[PDB]
Amino acid sequence: TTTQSYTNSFTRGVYYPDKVFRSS
Amino acid sequence: LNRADYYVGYLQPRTFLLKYNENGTITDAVDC
Amino acid sequence: VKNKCVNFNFNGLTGTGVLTKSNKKFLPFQQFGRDIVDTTDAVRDPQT
Ligand SMILES: *[C@@H]1O[C@H](CO)[C@@H](O)[C@H](O)[C@H]1NC(C)=O
C-alpha cells in the first residue's frame, strides 16, 4: 500500500541544462 | 523483493539562475 | 596540429582560430565551453 502525505521539496532537483563548461 | 522514499515532483518551464563554481560545478540556485 | 592559424571544423563547429594546450577542468559530460557572452571558448578534442 501507500500514503499520500505532502511535504516540501525545499531547494532540490537541479540538473545541468546543457554540457558547456562555465566558471565564475 | 524482500524477506520512506518515492519523492515525485513535476517540472514546469521556469527561469532559473545557477551559480557556477570556478571548477565548473554548481553551488547555489534561485527560482525566479 | 597546434600553435598555428588553422581552419578548424571540430564536431561540425566551423571557424578559424589558433589552437593550443589549455588548463581547463572539463567535466566528463562536457564537450564545449563558452564565456559570459556566448562564444565558443574551449573544445574537448573528440579523438584526443
Ligand atoms: C579516438 O581517436 C583515435 C582515432 O584513430 C583512436 O585511435 C583513439 O583511441 C581515440 N582517442 C581517444 C582519446 O578516445
Selecting from C24, C25, C30 the residue whose C-beta is nearest the C-beta of A19 gives C30
* Rounded Cα gap, residues B25 and B18, in angstroms: 10
* Rounded Cα gap, residues C35 and C37, in angstroms: 5
A20 in contact with chain B, both atoms CB, cutoff 8 A: no
Taking CB atoms and an 8 Å limit, are B29 and A24 in contact across chains?
A: no
Asked whether C47 lines ligand 1 (CB < 6 A), one says: yes
* Rounded Cα gap, residues C11 and B5, in angstroms: 42
**For chain B, the helix, strand and coil percentages under 3-state DSSP, each to the nearest 5:** 0, 35, 65
Among residues B2, B26, B22, C36, the alpha carbon closest in space to that of A13 is found at B26
Residue listed under C-alpha cell 592559424: C5
Taking CB atoms and an 8 Å limit, are B24 and A22 in contact across chains?
A: yes
